[PDB]
């Protein structure tokens, strides 16, 4: 029961907060953006990264952690929010990923 203007700016702010959370949390895993597809029966959140194995962790442990964090923060019901992970196509054609690689190299001490 909200106007469409505020509905859509809320969608945008949600996408932005998610992007910032993930680019702070999964920086060591090649986080190269996120998509948000709302639907009947759920909203799904498609992360696009490189180290999908490390995003998943063991038994999807970290995915469960992130689903729970998102749900608790954004007041979703358990089951109405889902997270998927995908190996991003064209890793070289992603600026955020190469910038994070530069960051980690310069921090490890490379020239």
């Amino acid at each position: 029961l909200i106007s469409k203007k505020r509905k859509l700016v809320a969608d945008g702010v949600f996408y932005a907060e998610l992007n910032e959370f993930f680019t702070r949390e999964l920086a060591e895993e090649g986080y190269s953006g996120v998509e948000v597809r709302v639907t009947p029966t759920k909203t799904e959140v498609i992360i696009r990264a490189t180290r999908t194995q490390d995003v998943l962790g063991e038994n999807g442990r970290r995915i469960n952690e992130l689903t729970l964090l998102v749900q608790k923060r954004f007041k979703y019901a358990p089951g109405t929010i889902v997270l998927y992970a995908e190996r991003v196509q064209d890793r070289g054609l992603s600026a955020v990923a190469q910038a994070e690689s530069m960051k980690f190299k310069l921090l490890n001490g490379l020239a």
């Binding site: 907060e17 959370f21 702070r24 469960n64 952690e65 923060r73």
Partner: protein, 92 residues
């Protein structure tokens, strides 16, 4: 920071049951969501936990996302008097 044992163990058992906790960076709130304890107590208890290697934090727009490690789940098991392998937030 000093706080009642019942509130501390409320925080700890919620953390063990869920695996995570989200706390708005709003002191003087007096009422955390999903926990009847003060948000200040939540934040500073989990801060004490962070400093001793158990739990880890991310701020991200004034919300203090907290999630625990293996050391944290073992410590909380030992603290809450629960058996070996009772339940973490790790069910498939």
């Amino acid at each position: 920071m000093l706080m009642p044992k019942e509130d501390r163990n409320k925080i700890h058992q919620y953390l063990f049951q869920e695996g995570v906790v989200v706390a708005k960076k709003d002191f003087n709130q007096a009422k955390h969501e999903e926990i009847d304890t003060k948000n200040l107590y939540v934040i500073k208890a989990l801060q004490s936990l962070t400093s001793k290697g158990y739990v880890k934090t991310q701020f991200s727009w004034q919300y203090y996302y907290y999630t625990l490690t293996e050391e944290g789940v073992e410590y909380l098991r030992e603290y809450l008097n629960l058996p070996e392998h009772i339940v973490p937030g790790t069910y498939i």
